[PDB]
Amino acid sequence: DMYIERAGDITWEKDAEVTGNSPRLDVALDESGDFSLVE
Amino acid sequence: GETTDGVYRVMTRRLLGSTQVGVGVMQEGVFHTMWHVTKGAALRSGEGRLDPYWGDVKQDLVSYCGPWKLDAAWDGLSEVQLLAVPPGERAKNIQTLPGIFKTKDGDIGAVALDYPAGTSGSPILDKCGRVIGLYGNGVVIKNGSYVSAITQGKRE
Numbered sequence: 184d185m186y187i188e189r190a191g192d193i194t195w196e197k198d199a200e201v202t203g204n205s206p207r208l209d210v211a212l213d214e215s216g217d218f219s220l221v222e
Numbered sequence: 223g224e225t226t227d228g229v230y231r232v233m234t235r236r237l238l239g240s241t242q243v244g245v246g247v248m249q250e251g252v253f254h255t256m257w258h259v260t261k262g263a264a265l266r267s268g269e270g271r272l273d274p275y276w277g278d279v280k281q282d283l284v285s286y287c288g289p290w291k292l293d294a295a296w297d298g299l300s301e302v303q304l305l306a307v308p309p310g311e312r313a314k315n316i317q318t319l320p321g322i323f324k325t326k327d328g329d330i331g332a333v334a335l336d337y338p339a340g341t342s343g344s345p346i347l348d349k350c351g352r353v354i355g356l357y358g359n360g361v362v363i364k365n366g367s368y369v370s371a372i373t374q375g376k377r378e
């Protein structure tokens with residue numbers, strides 16, 4: 184059985200930690216909702 | 223139960239202790255999460271029941287109590303924030319410039335941030351605080367790190 188618990192407000196935070204790159208990838212989406220890389 | 227707008231953890235007592243299987247967004251009386259989090263099962267909020275209303279395995283999305291309400295989109299240029307809600311950890315905003323998933327049916331923004339599986343359903347927001355999609359369905363690249371699509375539904 185599943186239950187939900189509040190975890191916070193949805194707001195933009197000024198001075199949040201900035202991380203992560205921006206890759207451009209060729210991908211395919213199958214009927215099961217799974218993404219895969221095309222090369 | 224609790225219907226206040228915000229980000230929520232999705233928990234289960236079926237496995238060892240209380241385990242966080244994902245995250246979701248409550249907006250306008252509707253709870254929004256990824257399909258793989260709940261598999262379309264009913265949810266509890268205190269003494270109240272949340273019944274699925276719409277879902278789609280290919281989009282990997284599901285809404286409870288009403289139709290999908292989130293319609294903001296990434297503008298294709300600006301930085302965004304993942305409001306990551308990791309298991310057992312406080313909600314934390316992480317700012318990133320999205321990459322792109324290029325498909326035969328069009329392009330979609332992607333966020334290159336790695337978090338535990340139970341973080342799926344965490345919202346991605348724009349500078350106005352609008353939810354432009356949920357985090358948690360994506361791919362593992364050459365290196366071994368995770369890249370999630372910015373998955374958004376359609377507000378009918």
Ligand SMILES: Cc1nsc(N[C@H]2CCC[C@]2(C)CO)n1
Pocket residue numbers: 212280281325326327328329330
């Ligand atoms: C038929 C379909 N169900 S979900 C979906 N999603 C598309 C819409 C644009 C690109 C996408 C994200 C991946 O091919 N397309």
